[PDB]
Each structure stands twice: as structure tokens, then as C-alpha cells.
Design a protein around this nucleic acid. Structure first.
Ligand SMILES: [Ca+2]
Ligand SMILES: [Ca+2]
Length: 341
DNA sequence: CCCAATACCAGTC
DNA sequence: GGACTGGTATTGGG
């Protein structure tokens, strides 16, 4: 199999830079502002000038400003980044039938039918980078390899504005010499628990008692890392199909009183429904974040689709349920729809 | 046997 | 989490 992975570089920041040419060469930090005290919020993404000084995705805005007091800080404009992204995914589609959109800024393509070898794939990758650059002024990184997992790794190695092939010889090599925390689907929490068993490389997952690795990171990530280590990871590129749609808003001030919490809850419902796109969900979960940032939720599944009005009344009852099984106050309230018809 | 339905948990931008 | 979306570990039945 020949897999071509496409990953847009510092995407949210780069779109901001393309729309606003007076930001290029400056450190740029795209932020999600919570609207509570000023500068309350996290960093969604920052460009590569800003990453050099340690401003990265996930850190609080106030923390970022402890490093780059004079970076440009911009409100996340998700809907804008989504238009651009959609247009770029359409470009990719002219290159292959078999395409898997993995997120707002990555797609895997199966080009086995379109090319005969890795050298032809490289030449297609370049074709793609230039198409995207010409039509959208967006730089991307490309990875090419035997499967999805290693196509992505190849991209994580060549970013930004890069392209890399990991051939059959380097795959064996990489299975030996490559930190396990650079393995897609392995974050701090998993890269942590594995760091205390000695397991520091993929290959290490083969010397440990299975049941122990299992009893350590679950039967999913074990079989996953093992299959990667045996070099027998075989997942096909398939169309991804959104399985849920939701909205979770931060409220002005905390609360534990049902009356202020709507709208948004109610705003969250109306916003989600416009994102539903005449998709009809059969399940609904009301989602609450308390004071200490812990997540509590209650849900219900109907034998039929949920109308917009039904969502309203059923979420209040789901809201009330939460209210009297957790005494603490609500910082953020939202809703989540799933099991579509 | 699933698996469905129910939540709390993990990776990503 | 921000704010999303999947994953994931219980459970309750057929
Ligand atoms: Ca990406
Ligand atoms: Ca990116």
C-alpha cells in the first residue's frame, strides 16, 4: 500500500497570516478566550516563530504572555479556518478516490492505484503541495509510507513546509529507534504510564508481558503499539463519518441555579442544531464542567430522532439530573448529539 | 456472545 | 478542558 498524508502547517495561525499579510514574520498566537476575566483561556495554536519561544497549543493565554508579551494574539475564528480547510480537501479529492479526512487539517490518501512506486509518489506529493500553495497560499507537509501510521510519522518528521518518504528499509529502522511518545494516539497520559515500565520504544512493547501492558494502558492501545512494533499495522483509508456534534459554552459567572444556566445550555442547543445539517440524532448528552474543571454529564437515547424543541426540554431534565448528583457549581455548560439516523 | 447505553478519560487544533 | 471529537471502562439487558 502507498499512503500519502497531508498536514497543513500551523494551520490556524497560517490562515490568519494569509488573510492579514501584516502579520508575516511576526510571532502569532491564536487563542480561545473564555470571556471570564481578561486573558482567561488557552492557546489553540501558534506559528513557528512563536513556538521557538515555547508558546504552544494547550497552555493558558496568561502563561503565553509570560514569554511573548509582544506576540500578536488573535481570537480563534474556527468557521474561517473551516472554509479554507474544506476547499483544500476538495483539491486533495482530485488526486484520489480513497481519501480519509482525519481532522480539520490532515488527510490520508491511498494512491496505490495512482502511482507505481515511492518515487512517483514523491512527485505527486510535490504536485499537491504546489496546487495547495497556488490556490490557497497555504503551505503543507507531506508524508509517504506503507500505512497511515508511518505516513503521518513521515510528516511529523518533515514539518513544516516539507515532504518525506519512509521506505521499507527505514520502517524496520524506525520500529527500533524511535521514542514511543511520538506515536500517534499516544499523549502525555499514555506516554507517562509507559515511561515507568521501562517501555520507552515501540520495540519494548514486545518484551513485556502482554497482560501487564494491557492492564497498564488498556486492550486497545496495547494491541495497537504491538501491531506497530511487529510491523503488521493494517488499517485501510476509509471515509470518516462524524459521529457527534456539540457545543459547550463558558458562562459569565459560575452557578448551580437552573435559571441562569439557560440559554446556553439553550444557546448550545441552537448552535449545535445549525451544525447538525438536517442530520437527526437519537441521543443527547448534556455536558457540564464544574468549578475545579471536572467533567460531569447525563444523557438519553430515544428510539427515534430528536426534534429541536424536544432537545430543549430533555436537556433541562438532563440538566436537573446533574444538578442534584453534584453539589458544586457550573463553570461551563453544553450539549452533545449523537446516534444519527 | 454481543451489544447498547451510560459516564468519565484522552488526544488534537 | 479552551473547545472539540473520539476512546474507554463499567453496567443493564436480550
Ligand atoms: Ca495535524
Ligand atoms: Ca497542523
Amino acid at each position: 500500500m502507498i499512503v500519502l498524508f497531508v498536514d497543513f502547517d500551523y494551520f490556524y495561525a497560517q490562515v490568519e497570516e494569509v488573510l492579514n499579510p501584516s502579520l508575516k514574520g511576526k510571532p502569532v498566537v491564536v487563542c480561545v478566550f473564555s470571556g471570564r476575566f481578561e486573558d482567561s483561556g488557552a492557546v489553540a495554536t501558534a506559528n513557528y516563530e512563536a513556538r521557538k519561544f515555547g508558546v504552544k497549543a494547550g497552555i493558558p493565554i496568561v502563561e503565553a504572555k509570560k514569554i511573548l508579551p509582544n506576540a500578536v494574539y488573535l481570537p480563534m475564528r474556527k468557521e474561517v479556518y473551516q472554509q479554507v480547510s474544506s476547499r483544500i480537501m476538495n483539491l486533495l479529492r482530485e488526486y484520489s478516490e480513497k481519501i480519509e479526512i482525519a481532522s480539520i487539517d490532515e488527510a490520508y490518501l491511498d494512491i496505490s492505484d495512482k502511482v507505481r512506486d515511492y518515487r512517483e509518489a514523491y512527485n505527486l506529493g510535490l504536485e499537491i503541495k504546489n496546487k495547495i500553495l497556488e490556490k490557497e497560499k497555504i503551505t503543507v507537509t507531506v508524508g509517504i509510507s506503507k500505512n497511515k501510521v508511518f505516513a503521518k510519522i513521515a510528516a511529523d518528521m518533515a514539518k513544516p513546509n516539507g515532504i518525506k518518504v519512509i521506505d521499507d528499509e527505514e520502517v524496520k529502522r524506525l520500529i527500533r529507534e524511535l521514542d514511543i511518545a511520538d506515536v500517534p494516539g499516544i499523549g502525555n497520559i499514555t506516554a507517562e504510564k509507559l515511561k515507568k515500565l521501562g517501555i520507552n520504544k515501540l520495540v519494548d512493547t514486545l518484551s513485556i508481558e502482554f497482560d501487564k501492558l494491557k492492564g497498564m494502558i488498556g486492550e486497545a492501545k496495547a494491541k495497537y503499539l504491538i501491531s506497530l512494533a511487529r510491523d503488521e499495522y493494517n488499517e485501510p483509508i476509509r471515509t470518516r463519518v462524524r459521529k457527534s456534534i456539540g457545543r459547550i459554552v463558558t458562562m459569565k459567572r459560575n452557578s448551580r441555579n437552573l435559571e441562569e444556566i439557560k440559554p446556553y445550555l439553550f444557546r448550545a442547543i441552537e448552535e449545535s442544531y445549525y451544525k447538525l445539517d438536517k442530520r437527526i440524532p437519537k441521543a443527547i448528552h448534556v455536558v457540564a464542567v464544574t468549578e475545579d474543571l471536572d467533567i460531569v454529564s447525563r444523557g438519553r437515547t430515544f428510539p427515534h430522532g430528536i426534534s429541536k424543541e424536544t432537545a430543549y426540554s430533555e436537556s433541562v431534565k438532563l440538566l436537573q439530573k446533574i444538578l442534584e448528583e453534584d453539589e458544586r457549581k457550573i463553570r461551563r455548560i453544553g450539549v452533545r448529539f449523537s446516534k444519527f439516523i
